[PDB]
Symmetry: C5
Subunit: 264 residues, 5 copies
Amino acid sequence: GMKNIESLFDYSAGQFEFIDHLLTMGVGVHFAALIFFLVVSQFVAPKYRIATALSCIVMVSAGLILNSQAVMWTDAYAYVDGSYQLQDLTFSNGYRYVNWMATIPCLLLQLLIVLNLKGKELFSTATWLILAAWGMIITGYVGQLYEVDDIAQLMIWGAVSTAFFVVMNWIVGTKIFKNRATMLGGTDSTITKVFWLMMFAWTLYPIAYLVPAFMNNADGVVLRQLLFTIADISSKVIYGLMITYIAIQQSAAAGYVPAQQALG
Amino acid sequence: GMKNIESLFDYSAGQFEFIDHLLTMGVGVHFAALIFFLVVSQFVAPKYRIATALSCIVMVSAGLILNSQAVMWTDAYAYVDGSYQLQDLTFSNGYRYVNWMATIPCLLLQLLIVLNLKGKELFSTATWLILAAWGMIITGYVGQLYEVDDIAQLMIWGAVSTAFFVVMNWIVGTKIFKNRATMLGGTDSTITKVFWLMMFAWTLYPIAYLVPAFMNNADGVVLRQLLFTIADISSKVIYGLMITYIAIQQSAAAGYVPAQQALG
Amino acid sequence: GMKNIESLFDYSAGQFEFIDHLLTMGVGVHFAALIFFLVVSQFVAPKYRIATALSCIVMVSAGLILNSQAVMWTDAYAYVDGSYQLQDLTFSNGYRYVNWMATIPCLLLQLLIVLNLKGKELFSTATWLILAAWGMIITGYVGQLYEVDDIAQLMIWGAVSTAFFVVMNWIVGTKIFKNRATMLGGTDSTITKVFWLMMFAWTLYPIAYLVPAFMNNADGVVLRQLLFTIADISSKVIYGLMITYIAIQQSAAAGYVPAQQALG
Amino acid sequence: GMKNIESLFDYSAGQFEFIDHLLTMGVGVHFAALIFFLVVSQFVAPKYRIATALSCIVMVSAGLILNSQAVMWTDAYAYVDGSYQLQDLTFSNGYRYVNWMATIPCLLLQLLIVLNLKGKELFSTATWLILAAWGMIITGYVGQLYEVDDIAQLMIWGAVSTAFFVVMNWIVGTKIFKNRATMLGGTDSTITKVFWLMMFAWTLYPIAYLVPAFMNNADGVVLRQLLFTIADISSKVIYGLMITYIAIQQSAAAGYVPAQQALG
Amino acid sequence: GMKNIESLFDYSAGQFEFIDHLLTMGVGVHFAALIFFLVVSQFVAPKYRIATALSCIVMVSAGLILNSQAVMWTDAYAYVDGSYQLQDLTFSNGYRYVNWMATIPCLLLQLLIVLNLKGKELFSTATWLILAAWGMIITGYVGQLYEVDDIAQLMIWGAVSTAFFVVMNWIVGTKIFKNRATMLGGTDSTITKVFWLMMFAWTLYPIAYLVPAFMNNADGVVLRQLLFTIADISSKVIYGLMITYIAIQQSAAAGYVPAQQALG
Ligand SMILES: CCCCCCCCCCCCCCCCCC(=O)OC[C@H](COP(=O)([O-])OCC[N+](C)(C)C)OC(=O)CCCCCCCCCCCCCCCCC
Ligand SMILES: CC1=C(/C=C/C(C)=C/C=C/C(C)=C/C=C/C=C(C)/C=C/C=C(C)/C=C/C=C(C)/C=C/[C@H](O)C(C)(C)O)C(C)(C)C[C@H](O)C1
Ligand SMILES: CC1=C(/C=C/C(C)=C/C=C/C(C)=C/C=C/C=C(C)/C=C/C=C(C)/C=C/C=C(C)/C=C/[C@H](O)C(C)(C)O)C(C)(C)C[C@H](O)C1
Ligand SMILES: CC1=C(/C=C/C(C)=C/C=C/C(C)=C/C=C/C=C(C)/C=C/C=C(C)/C=C/C=C(C)/C=C/[C@H](O)C(C)(C)O)C(C)(C)C[C@H](O)C1
Ligand SMILES: CC1=C(/C=C/C(C)=C/C=C/C(C)=C/C=C/C=C(C)/C=C/C=C(C)/C=C/C=C(C)/C=C/[C@H](O)C(C)(C)O)C(C)(C)C[C@H](O)C1
Ligand SMILES: CC1=C(/C=C/C(C)=C/C=C/C(C)=C/C=C/C=C(C)/C=C/C=C(C)/C=C/C=C(C)/C=C/[C@H](O)C(C)(C)O)C(C)(C)C[C@H](O)C1
Ligand SMILES: CCCCCCCCCCCC(=O)OC[C@H](COP(=O)(O)OCC[N+](C)(C)C)OC(=O)CCCCCCCCCCC
Ligand SMILES: CCCCCCCCCCCC(=O)OC[C@H](COP(=O)(O)OCC[N+](C)(C)C)OC(=O)CCCCCCCCCCC
Ligand SMILES: CCCCCCCCCCCC(=O)OC[C@H](COP(=O)(O)OCC[N+](C)(C)C)OC(=O)CCCCCCCCCCC
Ligand SMILES: *C/C=C(C)/C=C/C=C(C)/C=C/C1=C(C)CCCC1(C)C
Ligand SMILES: *C/C=C(C)/C=C/C=C(C)/C=C/C1=C(C)CCCC1(C)C
Ligand SMILES: *C/C=C(C)/C=C/C=C(C)/C=C/C1=C(C)CCCC1(C)C
Ligand SMILES: *C/C=C(C)/C=C/C=C(C)/C=C/C1=C(C)CCCC1(C)C
Ligand SMILES: *C/C=C(C)/C=C/C=C(C)/C=C/C1=C(C)CCCC1(C)C
Ligand SMILES: CCCCCCCCCCCCCCCCCC
Ligand SMILES: CCCCCCCCCCCCCCCC
Ligand SMILES: CCCCCCCCCCCCCCCC
Ligand SMILES: CCCCCCCCCCCCCCCC
Ligand SMILES: CCCCCCCCCCCCCCCC
Ligand SMILES: CCCCCCCCCCCCCCCC
Ligand SMILES: CCCCCCCCCCCCCC
Ligand SMILES: CCCCCCCCCCCCCC
Ligand SMILES: CCCCCCCCCC
Ligand SMILES: [Cl-]
Ligand SMILES: [Cl-]
Ligand SMILES: [Cl-]
Ligand SMILES: [Cl-]
Ligand SMILES: [Cl-]
Ligand SMILES: [Cl-]
Ligand SMILES: [Cl-]
Ligand SMILES: [Cl-]
Ligand SMILES: [Cl-]
C-alpha cells in the first residue's frame, strides 16, 4: 500500500521527537534567513540584486514545505502503548521532490548572475541547467515510488537521475572554473569554496535517496531526515549567505557606495 | 449528492499523495514569487509599476486559495483499509472558479499597461475584457455544477463559456499585435512569447473542465489536479516574470536609471 | 436557543460549498488589496497618504474577520446523511457587526481627507460621522439578536438603525456635493462615481439584514452571504481603489512628482 | 480546581457568541493599527520615531495574546443541550496579565519620549515606572488566583497592586503637568487629553479585576470581557494614535519636512 | 519510555495555566521585538547594520520555536478529573536545544561586530566561537536524553557541555575587555553591562538543565519553564536592544547623520 518507508515503522519517543526537533528547526532557519536577505539586499548593487532576491524565493518556498512536513509528522502519528504509530494519514518525502522543481532553478540562476554571465551566454546556460535539473528531479520522484515495493526499480531510476546530475554538475563546474578569474573584489577565492559547498551539500540528497536500499528501518528513517536537514541548511541558507557575500564584495569593487559603506 | 467527481472516488496512497504534493508546491511558489515581485519593483519606472503591483495581487490571492484547497484535501479524506476515503467534508474545485473573478482581471490589466495603452483606450479595453471574463467564469461555474449529474449540461454551459473566452482572446490578440511595434527596449520579441504562453497556459483550463466528460475516475482526478497546477504556475507566476521583465526593459529604454543599473 | 437563522438549517453540498467558496474568496481579495495599497502609497503625496493608510487598516481588519467566518463555517457543520448539518458550535454574523465599529470610521475618514476638508471642519465632521455610525451599528447588532425569535423586534431596531444611516448619508452627500468643485486633477467627476458606489454598496447591508423577514430558509442564507460578499468587495476594496486613484490625481495636480511620474 | 470564574459557568448562545465577537474584533484592530503605524512612521522625525516604533511593539504583542484567547474560547467550550459548556481545557485571563509585563513599559516609555524628557531624567523616570508597573502586575496576577477560592485574598492583593498603580499614576501625572509647557506645535492641549484618556482607560482594568467580587455569574463574565476590550482599544490603539499625532505635530514644529508636508 | 520529565506529571489547572501563560507571552515578545529592530535599523550605519539584522534572525527563529512549544503544550494535555494529564503526544524541550545551533552563533557574531573586530580577527574568532557553541549544544542535547533514565549520565554530559561553555565565555570575555577601550560614543560603559547581562542570562540555561537532578516534580517543571522564559527574554530580546543601542551610539560618533538625528 505505502510508498515510503517512513510509514512502515513505529518510533520510540526519542526517535519520533528527534525528527520533530529537526523538522521544526528547519522551518525557522528558512524564515529567519528570509528577513536577513531582505535587510542586506540594500547593500548589493542592482546589477546583482536579482541574486539576493532569488535567495528570498528559495527561503519562502523551502520554509513552507518544511512547515507542511513538520505538521504532517505530528498528525500522522500518535503515541500508543509506548510507541508512536501511524494513524489514518501517511507521511511521505515527495513534498520535497516536487518543490525542487522550483527551487533548484533558483539556486542555479543565482550562481550564474554572480559569475557575471550575461546575455546569450546567461540565457543558454540557464536553459540547459533547468532542463537537466527537471530531468534529474522527475526521474528521482518516480524512482522513490519504488522504495517499499521494488528496490531494483529504485536503483534503475536512480541511475538515470544520476546521469542528469552529472551533466548538471559538469556545466556548473565548467562555468565556475572558466569565470573565476574575472571575479571582482577577491571573490575568485570565495567562489571556489562555493563550488565545494555545492559538491558536498548536493551529494547528501542521493545518499538520502539510497537509505531504503541500505538501512530499511526506523534508524534509517532518522538518518534520512537528518541528511535532508543538513543538506537543506547547507545547500540553501549557507549557500545563499555565500552568494550574497560575493555579491556585496563585487558591488563594492564596482564602486557601489552602499556596498563600500557596508564593508567600512 | 456531490457536485464534483473528486468526491466520488477512493484514492491509492500514491494518487492521494501525489495530489497533496502538487497542491502544497503551488502554495509556496505563489508566496515566494510575491517576495520576488516586491524586491524587483524598485527597478520598474512608476509609469509601469502598477503592472508589477498587480502581480503581487495575483500571487497573494491565488496563493491563499491553493492553501485552502491543500488543507481541505487532507481534511476531507482519511486512510482506511488501505485507501484514502471521503469523511464528513467534501472536496470541490469551485474555490478556483470564484477566485478567477478577481485574478483574471488583474492578469489582463497588467498586459494592457506594458502594451503602453493609455486613457480612453486603456479604460475601454479594460472594461470589455473584464465583462468578457466575468461572463466566461460565471457560466463556467454553473456548468461545473453538472459534472457528476449531467454531462449534457456541463457541455452546454461549457460552450457558452467558450464563447466568452474566444471574444476575450480576440481582443487580447488584436491589442498585442497592433501595439507590438511601439514596444520599447526590443520587447516586441518578448511580448510575442507572452501571447503564445497565454494561448498554451489558458487553454489548459477548459481541458481540465472536460475531464469528467472523458476520464471519470481517480486517474482523471489526478490529471485534472496536475493540469490546474501547471496552468497556475504558467499563467500567473511565469507570465508575471515575463511582464516584469518587459516592464524593466522598457523602463530602461525610457531612461529610468534604476532600471538601467539593474541591466548593467 | 439560536440567534441567527444560519444555525437553523441543513444545507445541500452545493449550497454549503457555494457559501464556502464566497467566504474563501473574500479573505484573499482583502489581503491582496492590502499589498497593492502599500506598493502604490509611494505615489500619493504625504498630505493625502493617510487616506491610503486607512485603506490598509480596513483591508487587514476585514480580511481577518472573513478569515474567522470562513473557518467557523467549516467547523460548525459536517456532511452527514447527504446534507451538511450543525455540530457542537454555532455560526453567526455578529462578527461582522462588531468589526464595523472600527472599519466604518476608517472608510468615512478617508473620504473626508480626499475631499480636502481641513482643521475644525475635518474634526467636527469626523466626530458627528463616527457617532452616527456607532449609533447605526449598535442598534443593528441588538436588532439581529431577534432574527429567530421576534421579527417585530428585528424591524423596530432596524428602523432606529436606519435613522442613523440616513443622517450619516446626509452629512456625506452634503460634504461631497459642496466640495466637489474644489477637487483637483479632474476628480470632481470621479468623486461623484464614488458617492453612487457608496449608495449602492452600503444599501446591500440593510437588505441582508432583512432576509430573515422575507426569505427564512437555506436559500435566504445563501442570498445573505452573497450580498455580504459583494457589499464587502464594493464598499471596501473597490471604494478603496477609487479613493487612491483620486488621491494620486490630486497629488499630481498639486505638483508631487512621484504622482506625476506614476501618471506619465 | 479552577482559578477563574469564566470556567465555572455555562453560557447561552448569545452570551457565548457576544464574547467571541469581542475577542475576534480586538485581534484585528491591533493588527490593523500595526500597518497604519508603519506607514505613518515616515512622517515622524527620527528624534521621536522610537515612540511610533513602541506602538508597533504593543500592537503585535497584544494582538497575538488576543488571538490566543479567541482560539481558546472556542476550544474550551462546546454547544451541548442548548448551552455552551466547558470541555477538557480551561479558559483563563492570566494571558493578559503576563503580557502587560512587556506592554505596560512600552506604553509608558512612548509618553516620556514625546514629553521630550532626555538623558538622566529619561532613564531614571523609565526605571521607576517599570518597577512600579512590574510591582502592580505581579501582585495583580497572584491576586486573581483567588477569584474562585478566596475573595478576601483577591481584595488584599488588589490593595497592594493598587498601591503601585497610584505611585505610577503620580509619577506620570507629575511629568505630564511639569512638561506640558515645553511641548511644541500646540500639543500642550493634546497631551492633556492623553492624560485623561489614560485615567479613564487604565481604570477599567481594576474594575474588571473586581467583577468576581460583585457579579459572580455569566453576566459578569460578559461584562468583564467587554471591559477588557474597550480598555485594550482605548489604552493601546487610541492612545497610540494620539501619541503619533503629537509626535507629528512636534516634528513639524521642529522643522522636519516630511512632517510639514504630511500636515500641508 | 519518556525522555523528559515534563511528560511524567499531572498538573493542577493553576500550574498548567501558568506555563501556558509563560509560553504564550514569549512568542509575542519575540515577534514584537522583530518589528522594532526593523524600524530602528535605519538609524544604524551600514558598517554595523549586520548586527541589527542578526537580531532579526534570532527573533524570528526563537519566536517560531516558542510558538511550536506553546501549541504542543495545549495539545499534549487535557483536563480530566480535575487535573491536566498527558494524552497521545509527548512534550519535550529538545526543540530549543536544536534551535540554539542557529541562534547562539547569531548572538555571538552580533557582539563581535559592535566590538569593531574586522578581517582575520573577525573570522578567526567567529569560527572558534561557533565550534565551541556547537560543542556545548550537541553534548547538552545528548545529556538531556537521560533526564528520566539516568541522572548520572545527565551530569556527565553536563560536565562536558560546561567545558565548552567555559571556553566560549573565556573568548568572549577576553575580546570584550581587550576592545572596550576603542569603543566609540561612550559605549565602553555600555558594553560592560552587556557582558554582565550575558553572564546572568546565559547561566540560567545550565540551571534549567539541572532541575531533574534537584526538583523532579511538577513544581520543578514550572520552575524550568519560568527559567527558560526569563533567559530567552534576557538573552535575546534585551541583549538585542542593548547591542542596537550600542550600534546607534557608535554610528553617531562615526558621523552617520540618521543616527545623530535619532539621538537629537
Ligand atoms: C521588545 C519587548 C519589550 C521589552 C520587554 C521587557 C520590557 C522592558 C524590560 C526592561 C528594559 C529593557 C532594557 C532596556 C533596553 C536597553 C537600554 C539601552 O538602550 O541601553 C542600555 C542602557 C545604557 O546604559 P549606559 O551604560 O549607556 O548608561 C546609561 C545611559 N545614560 C548615561 C544616558 C543614563 O543601560 C541600561 O539601561 C541597562 C539596561 C539593563 C537591562 C537589565 C534588564 C534585564 C533583566 C530583566 C528581566 C526581565 C525579563 C522577563 C520579564 C520582561 C517582560 C517581558
Ligand atoms: C542514486 C544512485 C546512484 C548515485 C549515487 C551517488 C552518491 C551519486 C553521486 C554522484 C556525484 C557525487 C557526482 C558528482 C559529480 C561531479 C562532477 C560531474 C564534477 C564535475 C566537475 C567539473 C566538470 C569541473 C570542471 C572544471 C573545469 C572545467 C576547470 C578545471 C580546472 O580547475 C582549471 C580550468 C581551473 O584548470 C548510484 C548508487 C551510483 C547508482 C544508483 O543506481 C542510483
Ligand atoms: C469546454 C468545452 C469546449 C471548449 C473546449 C476547449 C478546449 C476550448 C478551447 C478553445 C480555445 C483554445 C480557444 C482559443 C482561442 C484563441 C483565439 C480566439 C485566438 C485569437 C487570436 C487572435 C484574435 C489574434 C489576432 C491577431 C491579429 C488581429 C493580428 C494578427 C497579425 O499579426 C496581423 C498584424 C497581420 O494582423 C468545447 C469542446 C468547444 C465545447 C464543449 O461542449 C465544452
Ligand atoms: C432595515 C430596515 C429598513 C431600512 C431598509 C433600507 C433598505 C434602508 C435604505 C435606506 C436608504 C437607501 C437610505 C439612503 C439615504 C440617502 C440619503 C440620505 C441621501 C442623501 C443625499 C444628500 C444629502 C445629497 C445632498 C446634496 C446636496 C446638499 C447638494 C446638492 C447639489 O446638487 C449641489 C451640487 C449644488 O450642492 C426599513 C425597511 C425602512 C424599515 C425596517 O423596519 C428596517
Ligand atoms: C482593585 C481594588 C481596589 C481599587 C480598584 C480601583 C477601581 C482603583 C482605582 C484607582 C484609581 C482611579 C487611581 C487613580 C489614581 C490617580 C492618580 C494617582 C493621579 C495622579 C495625578 C497627579 C499626580 C497629577 C499631578 C498634577 C500636578 C503635580 C500639577 C498640576 C498643575 O495643574 C500644574 C503643574 C500644571 O500647574 C480597591 C477598592 C481600592 C481595593 C480593593 O481591595 C482592590
Ligand atoms: C550543568 C552542569 C554543570 C555546570 C553547571 C553550571 C551552573 C555552570 C555555570 C558555569 C559558569 C557560570 C561559567 C562561567 C564562566 C565565566 C567565564 C569563563 C568568564 C570569563 C571572563 C573572562 C575571561 C574575562 C576576562 C577579562 C580580561 C582578560 C580583562 C583584562 C583586562 O581588564 C584588560 C586590560 C584586557 O581590559 C556542573 C555542575 C559544573 C557539572 C554538572 O555535572 C553539569
Ligand atoms: C528562474 C526564476 C526567476 C527568473 C528571473 C525573472 C526575471 C525578471 C526580473 C528581471 C530583472 C532584470 O534586470 O533582468 C535582467 C537579467 C538579464 O539581463 P542582464 O543580467 O542585465 O544581462 C546584461 C546583458 N544584456 C543587456 C544583453 C541582457 O535578467 C535575468 O537574469 C533573466 C533571467 C534569464 C534566465 C531565464 C531562463 C529561461 C528558462 C527557460 C527554460 C524552461
Ligand atoms: C479613525 C481612525 C483615525 C486615525 C487618524 C489619526 C492618526 C494620526 C496620524 C497623523 C497623521 C497626520 O497627518 O495628522 C494630521 C491629519 C490631518 O489633520 P490636520 O493636517 O491637522 O488638519 C489640517 C490642519 N490645518 C487647518 C491647521 C492645516 O489628522 C487627521 O487626519 C486627524 C483625523 C481626525 C480625527 C477624528 C477624531 C474624531 C474622534 C471622535 C470620537 C467619538
Ligand atoms: C528595570 C529596567 C529599567 C531600564 C529601563 C531603560 C530605559 C530606556 C532607555 C531609553 C531608551 C529610549 O527610549 O531612547 C534611547 C535613546 C534616547 O537617548 P537620548 O537621551 O535622547 O540621547 C541624547 C543624549 N544626551 C541626553 C546626553 C543629550 O534614543 C535612541 O536613539 C536609541 C534607539 C533605540 C535603542 C533601543 C532601546 C529602546 C528600548 C525600549 C524598550 C523598553
Ligand atoms: C534545496 C534543494 C536542493 C539543492 C536539491 C537537490 C537535489 C538533488 C541534487 C537530487 C538528486 C537526486 C539524484 C542525483 C539521484 C536520486 C534522486 C535525486 C532526485 C535525489
Ligand atoms: C490564473 C487563472 C487563470 C488564468 C484562469 C483561466 C481560466 C479560463 C481561461 C477558463 C476557461 C473556461 C472555459 C473556456 C470553458 C469551461 C469553463 C472555463 C471557465 C474553465
Ligand atoms: C465594510 C462595511 C460597511 C461599509 C458596512 C456598512 C453597514 C451598514 C450601512 C449597516 C446598516 C444597517 C442599517 C441601516 C439597518 C439595519 C442594520 C444595519 C446595521 C445592517
Ligand atoms: C494594555 C494594557 C494596560 C494599559 C494595562 C493596564 C493594567 C492595569 C492598570 C492593571 C491594574 C490592576 C490594579 C490597579 C489592581 C488590580 C490588579 C490589576 C493588575 C488589574
Ligand atoms: C537564546 C539561547 C541561548 C543564549 C542559549 C544558551 C545556552 C547555554 C549557555 C546552554 C548551556 C548548557 C550548559 C552549559 C550545560 C548544560 C547543557 C546546556 C546546553 C543547557
Ligand atoms: C441544491 C442547490 C444547488 C445549487 C447551489 C447554489 C448555486 C450557486 C450558483 C451561483 C452562480 C455563480 C456565481 C459565481 C460568481 C460569484 C460572485 C462573487
Ligand atoms: C534516544 C534515541 C534518539 C536518537 C537521536 C539522538 C541524536 C543525537 C545527536 C544530536 C544532534 C543535535 C543537533 C542536530 C543537527 C542539525
Ligand atoms: C509541476 C510538475 C510536477 C512534478 C512531476 C512529477 C512526476 C509525476 C509522475 C508520477 C505520478 C504519480 C501517480 C501515482 C503513482 C502510483
Ligand atoms: C466595543 C464593541 C461593542 C459594540 C457591540 C454592541 C453592543 C451589543 C449589545 C449587547 C448584547 C450582548 C448580550 C447578549 C445577550 C443575549
Ligand atoms: C516573564 C516573567 C513572568 C512573570 C509573570 C507574573 C509573576 C508570576 C507570579 C507567580 C505565581 C505563579 C503561580 C504558580 C501556580 C499556582
Ligand atoms: C574584569 C573581568 C571580569 C571577570 C570575570 C567574572 C566572570 C564571572 C561569571 C559568573 C557567572 C554568574 C553571573 C552573575 C550575573 C550577575
Ligand atoms: C576540480 C574539480 C573536480 C572535482 C570533482 C568533484 C567531485 C566531488 C565529490 C563529492 C564529495 C565531496 C564533498 C566535499
Ligand atoms: C491636575 C489634574 C489632577 C488629576 C486627578 C486624577 C483623578 C483620576 C480620576 C479617575 C479617572 C476617570 C476617567 C475619566
Ligand atoms: C518601586 C516603585 C517605586 C519607585 C519610586 C521612586 C521615586 C520616584 C520619584 C520620581
Ligand atoms: Cl547596479
Ligand atoms: Cl526545496
Ligand atoms: Cl515613470
Ligand atoms: Cl486564481
Ligand atoms: Cl504632501
Ligand atoms: Cl468589516
Ligand atoms: Cl530627528
Ligand atoms: Cl497586553
Ligand atoms: Cl557604514
